[PDB]
Design a binder for this molecule. Structure first.
Ligand SMILES: OC[C@H]1O[C@@H](O[C@H]2[C@H](O)[C@@H](O)[C@H](O[C@H]3[C@H](O)[C@@H](O)[C@@H](O)O[C@@H]3CO)O[C@@H]2CO)[C@H](O)[C@@H](O)[C@@H]1O
Length: 300
């Protein structure tokens, strides 16, 4: 009864809080690309994650390019399936417009506005929804002030016309790591959070200090994607550094979603090759990454 209990989320003094003003921390899983591993996103697998892992949020990663929504828009119905399952399971759900190779969010901004108009019209009167309008802006030519902020200032009004105050997570520069620039030039909407993403394969001490800098400017931060692997999503599992970041996020009350729920043979994948797409996984069906992430959420 997560959503019944916490209900309407909002941002108060840079912190995510529930409808009674208490701090709340979401912890859950992100799908991998819905165009590739959509079979793992369904009511049964999400219910298994809720009941066995303890998740209270699920992120639907709808890639825009790389065979995603722009090339085949049918994937938006898998996002609707995920949202409806989250509503039925009474957990939160992040609708992620998952830019990556299309590194500037302005590339498909017209399509983004139409997509977020549709999603906010359909689900804007449910408290479960969190909109993530640009996964990972990247590249030297994509900056907060020139590209990302103006993009957000076109897409947020579209959402706000249908849904006045559910949370909106906005990506930051350099694959959603540059929270320092966003925190010094914040958006006006009071229920916005800035995305911060990390990979445990990278030594993270300065990145933690940079998150703290942003928090000190009153910016709210959502760790909408992080992995136990290197920045490519593979290259080994780095659980010592992952635990440092888990503890950091608990101390700072940061919400998070781990990448990712798939059986792909890469270190960040949570499942092994024979895992059932509808849930019920044994210990042997969870990868080293999945076992750790499950433990962290169950401990919570
Ligand atoms: O097998 C499907 C498809 O995978 C593509 O590689 C993926 C990695 O598997 C995935 O882990 C990685 O995820 C990135 C996520 O999208 C970003 O937001 C981010 O923070 O980094 C994550 C890990 O780097 O994305 C890549 C690229 O989409 C293969 O490239 C492709 O050939 C294959 O079909």
């Amino acid at each position: 009864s997560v959503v019944e209990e916490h209900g309407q989320l909002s941002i108060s003094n840079g912190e995510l809080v529930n409808e009674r003003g208490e701090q709340v921390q979401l912890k859950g899983m992100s799908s991998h690309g819905l165009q590739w591993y959509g079979q793992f996103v369904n009511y049964e697998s999400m219910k298994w994650l809720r009941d066995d892992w303890g998740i209270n949020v699920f992120r639907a990663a709808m890639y825009t390019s790389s065979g995603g929504y722009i090339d085949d828009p049918s994937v938006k119905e898998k996002v609707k399936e995920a949202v409806e399952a989250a509503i039925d399971l009474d957990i939160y759900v992040i609708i992620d417009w998952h830019i990556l190779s299309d590194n500037d969010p302005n590339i498909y901004k017209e399509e983004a506005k139409d997509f977020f108009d549709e999603m906010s019209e359909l689900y804007g009167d449910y408290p479960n929804v969190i909109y993530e309008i640009a996964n990972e802006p990247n590249g030297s030519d994509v900056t907060w002030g020139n590209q990302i902020k103006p993009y957000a200032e076109e897409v947020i009004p579209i959402i706000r016309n249908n849904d006045p105050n559910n949370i909106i997570i906005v990506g930051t520069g350099t694959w959603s790591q540059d929270v320092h620039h966003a925190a010094d030039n914040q958006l006006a909407d009071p229920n916005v959070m800035y995305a911060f993403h990390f990979y445990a394969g990278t030594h993270g001490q300065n990145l933690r200090d940079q998150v703290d800098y942003a928090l000190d400017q009153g910016a709210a931060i959502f760790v909408s994607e992080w992995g136990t692997s290197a920045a490519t999503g593979d290259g080994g599992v780095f659980l010592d550094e992952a635990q440092v970041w888990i503890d950091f996020m608990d101390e700072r009350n940061l919400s998070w979603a781990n990448w990712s729920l798939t059986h792909k043979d890469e270190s960040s994948a949570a499942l092994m090759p024979g895992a059932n797409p509808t849930g019920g996984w044994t210990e042997a069906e969870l990868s080293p990454s999945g076992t750790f992430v499950r433990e962290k959420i169950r401990e919570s």
